[PDB]
Design a protein around this ligand. Sequence first.
Ligand SMILES: N[C@@H](CCC(=O)N[C@@H](CS(=O)O)C(=O)NCC(=O)O)C(=O)O
Lengths: 204, 204
Amino acid sequence: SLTLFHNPASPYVRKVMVLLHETGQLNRVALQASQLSPVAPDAALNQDNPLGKIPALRLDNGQVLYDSRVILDYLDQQHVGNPLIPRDGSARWRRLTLAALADGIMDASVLVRYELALRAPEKHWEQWLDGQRDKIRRALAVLEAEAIAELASHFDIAAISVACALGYLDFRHPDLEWRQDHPQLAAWYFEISQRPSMLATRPP
Amino acid sequence: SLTLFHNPASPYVRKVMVLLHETGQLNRVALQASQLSPVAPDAALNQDNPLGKIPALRLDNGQVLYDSRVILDYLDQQHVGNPLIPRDGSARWRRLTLAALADGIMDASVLVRYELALRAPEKHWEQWLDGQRDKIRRALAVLEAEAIAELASHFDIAAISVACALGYLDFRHPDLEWRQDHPQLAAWYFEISQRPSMLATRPP
Ligand SMILES: N[C@@H](CCC(=O)N[C@@H](CS(=O)O)C(=O)NCC(=O)O)C(=O)O
């Protein structure tokens, strides 16, 4: 069977968990708990993913896949349902670009979390923090437009990725109050939060 | 024709350029010079690229793709013959994981560069910087121990990504010596550095 390095905070892990739920493949995956940060290595994880990041997926044959987008691609090709990642043509490119937009939000969000929670306050750099927050805000604006119609078309790779990014803002960055100025996105997210796969994968 | 939002220092742009050379698709592309935004997002927007993604690829009919991994997939699917990303088989996820290893080297390398170059010295956090350097070192060790034959077998998505990551280490982090403990990787890099795709795309 498969083994996924996991913890319930990670929104990248959450993408994987949501895809597993949606595709009926939770039964294939043992969870290996990991607590970690860039200054607190997990030695067991590092033996499998030298980058020291989660998610990482150990296959039945012992090979390891990372990062999250590689794992999601692998898992999407294992089931016979409709794919969550379009296999060809225009949709493939469009939906993977929205997924990358969402990953960029997560990347900035995690960096701001680590600076605020781990770095000594006297070493915080406010202009850096605000630059990351502004990159998140600009991406949210594009998502507001996408929430008009494109986002809701399918609960697929793009929708999962965006949903996990918004859930992570709620969890670690409520001060960004993303709903206040993004009502269309707020409505979309309120709906997709009720999906069983989202309810089962919320952070602590 | 296509437009690539381009910067010559970025190793992520470099992967795209190398793949365009290697697949014979430079005759498709016009470059549009674009400024990296390490701290505050750029105040000058191109309306097709409101998030200032670099690389970003604007298709013949105006859709814009990003990030580099999405662009690489798109471009690889636009030519016939030998794909540089395997379409299926164990090799697909093996080569994509090796590419992700390389992207992780680049990610750690950029974080270290931007902190060292842009953040005030008194606010540098050495244990954080070393945690990122340790990702790089562990990843190099995996390449040397596990990936030499793989890299040599095909100058593909994995090899291009690794090559660009090593070029970026030489460019921004020559203090991080990597050739001594990874002699096979060093020899391979010396060889592939002479490919026209690599010579043409070296950072300034
Ligand atoms: N490109 C990767 C990013 C994973 C990541 O940053 N994960 C964080 C945990 S966070 O999501 O809770 C992680 O592993 N941090 C540890 C570290 O950076 O040392 C992916 O898409 O899987």
